[model samples]
Target: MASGKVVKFSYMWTINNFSFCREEMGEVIKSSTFSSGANDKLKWCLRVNPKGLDEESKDYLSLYLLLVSCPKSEVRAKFKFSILNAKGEETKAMESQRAYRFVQGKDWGFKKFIRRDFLLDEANGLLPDDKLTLFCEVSVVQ
Candidate 1:
């Protein structure tokens, strides 16, 4: 058995089909002060890292996400998730390929997924002391 607390969860939303102002050709995006707002009908991704835990059970991190504020008739959407390390290496990736219905006016749609247990094993050996990163990719269509 292992006990620990999550330190931080950071998210980045992006559209694969379209490029933003900073993403344009020859444009340089700085890391110091960049922020993206959440809006309807957009693609997004979230990255979460939980620190300050025992290195022995570092690979057993669990994550879940919920969808809220979606329209009633807009029940078809898809999402993907991945597990990565501090060095930007991907250890696990999961995707929701089927179209699922979302309940309108309510947080009725909840998706839960578990990555392969070995992902933790990979992280325990590769990641630095007290850190792990989880990535999420969500694509929604109207």
Candidate 2:
């Protein structure tokens, strides 16, 4: 029952007026839905919160990898999230230790990705021109 199929993909997400979004703590932004590949049956996407998704993580930023749709039973995958500086360098990064099972509408990620204050500091270069840029790498298995 193992397809042993694996697909790796990377996504870049840009948030305009990051400061504004940071103020709206509960707000969420989603990346365009993508498939593992042209012939892949499952679809995926990314979600992010500038000021965390809940009270426990309110002082940080949150990022997640989502299972948009699955034609089969389930999926397993690993993902990494990174904050990109103005020069496109990864300033901050976090990754899953191993593949995690995924069902439709389910997601996995860091609820406290990076402290809001550190990310907000202009000197860190995580934000440029009031915009926050993020990079995500995903590896899906079937």
Tell me the TM-score of each prediction against the true structure.
0.44, 0.88
lDDT of 2 at 65: 91
lDDT of 1 by residue, 1-142 (tens): 6544322234432222111122322222211212222333222223122211234324333343344334344545555566555566665566667644544332211122332244335434333343444455544453
* lDDT minimum window of 10 residues, candidate 1: 28-37
Clash numbers, per candidate = 3, 0
Q: Please report the candidate that would top lDDT against the real structure.
A: 2
lDDT of 2 by residue, 37-130 (tens): 4357678888888778889999988888999998877888888999889887986888898999999999999999999999888788888898
Cα error, residue 34 of model 2, in Å, equals 1.3
- Misplaced by over 4 Å in model 2 are 1-6
